[PDB]
C-alpha cells in the first residue's frame with residue numbers, strides 16, 4: 001500500500017523498486033514517511049519501457 | 050506473484066493472461082517454472098493498447 005505503483009511484488013517476498021533508491025530513499029520507506037509521487041514519474045518509465 | 054504483470058485478476062477467480070499461451074505455456078505456469086520476462090513485452094502491449 002505504501003510503495004503503491006513505484007515497485008512490483010517479485011513474489012519471492014521482495015518488492016522490485018523500479019527507480020534509483022539511495023539509502024535515505026530506503027529509510028524513508030521503512031518508517032512509512034516515504035511518498036510515491038516523488039519517484040512516480042521515474043519508476044513508471046522503467047516499468048513500461 | 051508468478052504471473053507478475055503478464056496477466057490480471059478478473060476477480061471471478063481467474064487470471065486473464067494478455068498473451069497467446071499454448072498448452073506448454075500453461076503447463077510451465079502450473080509447476081512454477083514459467084518466466085514473466087519471456088512474454089512481458091508481448092502481454093504489456095495488449096494491456097495498454
Ligand SMILES: *[C@@H]1O[C@H](CO)[C@@H](O)[C@H](O)[C@H]1NC(C)=O
Nearest residue numbers: 024025027028029031032033
Ligand atoms: C524516516 O526516514 C527519514 C529519512 O528521510 C528520517 O528523516 C525520519 O526521521 C525517519 N522517521 C522515522 C520514524 O524513523
Ligand SMILES: *[C@@H]1O[C@H](CO)[C@@H](O)[C@H](O)[C@H]1NC(C)=O
Nearest residue numbers: 073074076077078080081082
Ligand atoms: C513444467 O512444465 C515444463 C513445460 O515447459 C516441463 O518441461 C517441466 O517438466 C514441468 N515441471 C514440472 C515440475 O512438472
